[PDB]
PDB file of all heavy atoms in Angstrom:
ATOM      1  N   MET D 223      33.821 -21.354  95.677  1.00  0.00           N
ATOM      2  CA  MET D 223      33.727 -21.854  94.336  1.00  0.00           C
ATOM      3  C   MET D 223      34.643 -23.081  94.150  1.00  0.00           C
ATOM      4  O   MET D 223      35.821 -22.979  94.384  1.00  0.00           O
ATOM      5  CB  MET D 223      34.254 -20.795  93.399  1.00  0.00           C
ATOM      6  CG  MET D 223      34.055 -21.099  91.906  1.00  0.00           C
ATOM      7  SD  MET D 223      34.374 -19.628  90.929  1.00  0.00           S
ATOM      8  CE  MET D 223      34.057 -20.098  89.247  1.00  0.00           C
ATOM      9  N   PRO D 224      34.070 -24.198  93.683  1.00  0.00           N
ATOM     10  CA  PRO D 224      34.950 -25.307  93.431  1.00  0.00           C
ATOM     11  C   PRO D 224      35.984 -25.028  92.322  1.00  0.00           C
ATOM     12  O   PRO D 224      35.591 -24.454  91.303  1.00  0.00           O
ATOM     13  CB  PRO D 224      34.032 -26.417  92.996  1.00  0.00           C
ATOM     14  CG  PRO D 224      32.648 -26.043  93.507  1.00  0.00           C
ATOM     15  CD  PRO D 224      32.700 -24.574  93.376  1.00  0.00           C
ATOM     16  N   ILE D 225      37.238 -25.414  92.599  1.00  0.00           N
ATOM     17  CA  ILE D 225      38.315 -25.074  91.786  1.00  0.00           C
ATOM     18  C   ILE D 225      38.398 -25.935  90.515  1.00  0.00           C
ATOM     19  O   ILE D 225      39.087 -25.578  89.594  1.00  0.00           O
ATOM     20  CB  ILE D 225      39.699 -25.150  92.450  1.00  0.00           C
ATOM     21  CG1 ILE D 225      40.055 -26.557  92.828  1.00  0.00           C
ATOM     22  CG2 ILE D 225      39.674 -24.130  93.589  1.00  0.00           C
ATOM     23  CD1 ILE D 225      41.386 -26.820  93.454  1.00  0.00           C
ATOM     24  N   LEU D 226      37.660 -27.037  90.489  1.00  0.00           N
ATOM     25  CA  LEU D 226      37.551 -27.905  89.299  1.00  0.00           C
ATOM     26  C   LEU D 226      36.101 -28.018  88.858  1.00  0.00           C
ATOM     27  O   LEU D 226      35.200 -28.473  89.561  1.00  0.00           O
ATOM     28  CB  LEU D 226      38.170 -29.245  89.695  1.00  0.00           C
ATOM     29  CG  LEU D 226      38.261 -30.374  88.693  1.00  0.00           C
ATOM     30  CD1 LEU D 226      38.761 -29.873  87.310  1.00  0.00           C
ATOM     31  CD2 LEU D 226      39.262 -31.388  89.227  1.00  0.00           C
ATOM     32  N   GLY D 227      35.842 -27.544  87.606  1.00  0.00           N
ATOM     33  CA  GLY D 227      34.493 -27.662  87.135  1.00  0.00           C
ATOM     34  C   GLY D 227      34.454 -28.316  85.728  1.00  0.00           C
ATOM     35  O   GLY D 227      35.537 -28.565  85.131  1.00  0.00           O
ATOM     36  N   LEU D 228      33.316 -28.628  85.256  1.00  0.00           N
ATOM     37  CA  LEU D 228      33.090 -29.182  83.934  1.00  0.00           C
ATOM     38  C   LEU D 228      32.685 -28.160  82.921  1.00  0.00           C
ATOM     39  O   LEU D 228      31.699 -27.442  83.073  1.00  0.00           O
ATOM     40  CB  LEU D 228      31.953 -30.233  83.967  1.00  0.00           C
ATOM     41  CG  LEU D 228      31.628 -31.028  82.744  1.00  0.00           C
ATOM     42  CD1 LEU D 228      32.691 -32.055  82.438  1.00  0.00           C
ATOM     43  CD2 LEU D 228      30.282 -31.727  82.831  1.00  0.00           C
ATOM     44  N   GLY D 229      33.523 -28.095  81.839  1.00  0.00           N
ATOM     45  CA  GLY D 229      33.180 -27.260  80.700  1.00  0.00           C
ATOM     46  C   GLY D 229      32.160 -27.912  79.821  1.00  0.00           C
ATOM     47  O   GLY D 229      32.021 -29.126  79.719  1.00  0.00           O
ATOM     48  N   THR D 230      31.370 -27.140  79.106  1.00  0.00           N
ATOM     49  CA  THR D 230      30.285 -27.663  78.217  1.00  0.00           C
ATOM     50  C   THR D 230      30.294 -27.007  76.840  1.00  0.00           C
ATOM     51  O   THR D 230      29.372 -27.293  76.057  1.00  0.00           O
ATOM     52  CB  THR D 230      28.889 -27.483  78.853  1.00  0.00           C
ATOM     53  OG1 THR D 230      28.654 -26.068  79.140  1.00  0.00           O
ATOM     54  CG2 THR D 230      28.789 -28.203  80.197  1.00  0.00           C
ATOM     55  N   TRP D 231      31.233 -26.197  76.474  1.00  0.00           N
ATOM     56  CA  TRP D 231      31.256 -25.705  75.123  1.00  0.00           C
ATOM     57  C   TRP D 231      31.601 -26.827  74.190  1.00  0.00           C
ATOM     58  O   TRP D 231      32.567 -27.639  74.409  1.00  0.00           O
ATOM     59  CB  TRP D 231      32.323 -24.604  74.955  1.00  0.00           C
ATOM     60  CG  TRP D 231      32.509 -24.126  73.517  1.00  0.00           C
ATOM     61  CD1 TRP D 231      31.588 -23.966  72.531  1.00  0.00           C
ATOM     62  CD2 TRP D 231      33.775 -23.767  72.932  1.00  0.00           C
ATOM     63  NE1 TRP D 231      32.183 -23.500  71.363  1.00  0.00           N
ATOM     64  CE2 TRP D 231      33.500 -23.380  71.593  1.00  0.00           C
ATOM     65  CE3 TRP D 231      35.082 -23.729  73.424  1.00  0.00           C
ATOM     66  CZ2 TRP D 231      34.528 -22.984  70.745  1.00  0.00           C
ATOM     67  CZ3 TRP D 231      36.073 -23.304  72.581  1.00  0.00           C
ATOM     68  CH2 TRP D 231      35.815 -22.929  71.275  1.00  0.00           C
ATOM     69  N   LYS D 232      30.775 -27.055  73.145  1.00  0.00           N
ATOM     70  CA  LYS D 232      30.868 -28.080  72.110  1.00  0.00           C
ATOM     71  C   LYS D 232      30.322 -29.421  72.578  1.00  0.00           C
ATOM     72  O   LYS D 232      30.407 -30.382  71.821  1.00  0.00           O
ATOM     73  CB  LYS D 232      32.274 -28.272  71.536  1.00  0.00           C
ATOM     74  CG  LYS D 232      33.050 -26.999  71.217  1.00  0.00           C
ATOM     75  CD  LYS D 232      34.506 -27.184  70.947  1.00  0.00           C
ATOM     76  CE  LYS D 232      35.448 -26.808  72.071  1.00  0.00           C
ATOM     77  NZ  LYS D 232      35.187 -27.635  73.258  1.00  0.00           N
ATOM     78  N   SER D 233      29.801 -29.478  73.788  1.00  0.00           N
ATOM     79  CA  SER D 233      29.165 -30.744  74.234  1.00  0.00           C
ATOM     80  C   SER D 233      27.845 -30.858  73.562  1.00  0.00           C
ATOM     81  O   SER D 233      26.938 -30.068  73.866  1.00  0.00           O
ATOM     82  CB  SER D 233      29.038 -30.740  75.768  1.00  0.00           C
ATOM     83  OG  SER D 233      30.354 -30.594  76.321  1.00  0.00           O
ATOM     84  N   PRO D 234      27.665 -31.799  72.635  1.00  0.00           N
ATOM     85  CA  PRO D 234      26.379 -31.727  71.919  1.00  0.00           C
ATOM     86  C   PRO D 234      25.246 -32.016  72.838  1.00  0.00           C
ATOM     87  O   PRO D 234      25.294 -32.764  73.824  1.00  0.00           O
ATOM     88  CB  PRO D 234      26.558 -32.872  70.935  1.00  0.00           C
ATOM     89  CG  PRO D 234      28.028 -33.081  70.766  1.00  0.00           C
ATOM     90  CD  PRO D 234      28.589 -32.825  72.165  1.00  0.00           C
ATOM     91  N   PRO D 235      24.092 -31.432  72.510  1.00  0.00           N
ATOM     92  CA  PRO D 235      22.867 -31.642  73.199  1.00  0.00           C
ATOM     93  C   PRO D 235      22.548 -33.149  73.252  1.00  0.00           C
ATOM     94  O   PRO D 235      22.092 -33.624  74.294  1.00  0.00           O
ATOM     95  CB  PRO D 235      21.774 -30.970  72.307  1.00  0.00           C
ATOM     96  CG  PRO D 235      22.552 -29.989  71.494  1.00  0.00           C
ATOM     97  CD  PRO D 235      24.007 -30.410  71.430  1.00  0.00           C
ATOM     98  N   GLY D 236      22.921 -33.875  72.240  1.00  0.00           N
ATOM     99  CA  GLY D 236      22.606 -35.326  72.296  1.00  0.00           C
ATOM    100  C   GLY D 236      23.511 -36.080  73.291  1.00  0.00           C
ATOM    101  O   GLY D 236      23.100 -37.215  73.624  1.00  0.00           O
TER     102      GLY D 236
END
Side-chain angles (χ1 to χ4, degrees):
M223 188 169 183
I225 67 177
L226 184 42
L228 183 73
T230 58
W231 175 37
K232 314 169 257 61
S233 301

